[PDB]
Amino acid sequence: RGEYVVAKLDDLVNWARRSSLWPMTFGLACCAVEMMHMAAPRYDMDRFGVVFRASPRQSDVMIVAGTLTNKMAPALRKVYDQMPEPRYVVSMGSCANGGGYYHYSYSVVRGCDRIVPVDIYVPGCPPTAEALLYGILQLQRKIKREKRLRIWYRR
Template sequence: MSTNPSFEPIMAANGKLVAPDQGFFNDLSNEVSDKGFLVTSTEELFQWARTGSLWWMTFGLACCAVEMIHVNMPRYDMERFGAAPRASPRQSDVMIVAGTLCNKMAPALRKVYDQMSNPKYVISMGSCANGGGYYHYSYSVVRGCDRIVPVDIYVPGCPPTAEALLYGIMQLQRKIRRVGTIER
């Protein structure tokens, strides 16, 4: 992912990842320290809160789920970007679909998606979740989870690295901040 030019701005000079809108937060901090208060709309406040508190649930179906686990470990520590794992779909607002989606598993995926509260977002992780991957021509494989649930962010790779998933989470945060509540 480091060859992608859009990934470079979130890399600090020391090689560590920084929040995608760190400059925005620095300006915000300066304004609060100068004036002592902020003037904003409630919609902007809600958008900011949504980007900083993405609670995601795993729908790990294959080997991509191992890379998804790496993102929670201390090396990447996804919680510092405001994303934390949850076990229940009723507590989650992001679903990460990682791995091969079979025809028998598709109704379960849809049921879990329907149990999530609004606004809800989906990240498709890996070639198998994006389009069937290696098993694309198999009779029992769904050729992309976007045929079952609406997908907001696609993370390519087989399997994608933990950095790629972290970048996908940050892209979702940017999308929420830019668009607001994504209407379905």
């Protein structure tokens, strides 16, 4: 029946989506250096069919990392809006998650969620490359448990 047809099509689409997650790593601080340990020869980032990509026009997940100041805030939202559908932002590190140890500072916005709809919160200071890779795997499974075609079919 039709329900099975859309379910298989839904499986196929998300298989691509949970495979070629070309990332906008928008890290700014010591969360940024530890992420390269996830683009490492030690833990390959390219091995899960995902390659660090410039030109935000072709990007799917935006890795936000490092402390987020007020000055950066206008620039972070504009690039997020330039990012195409689908777009997921993974908050990396204590600073980008809730503000972190730079919480009460006069020039830090507490957490990136106040500016962008975060999909995955990766805790850490810095989040070890394994931990942030685990978050990417967590986001990968999130794409798997997606029902885009089901909602349209059952609208």
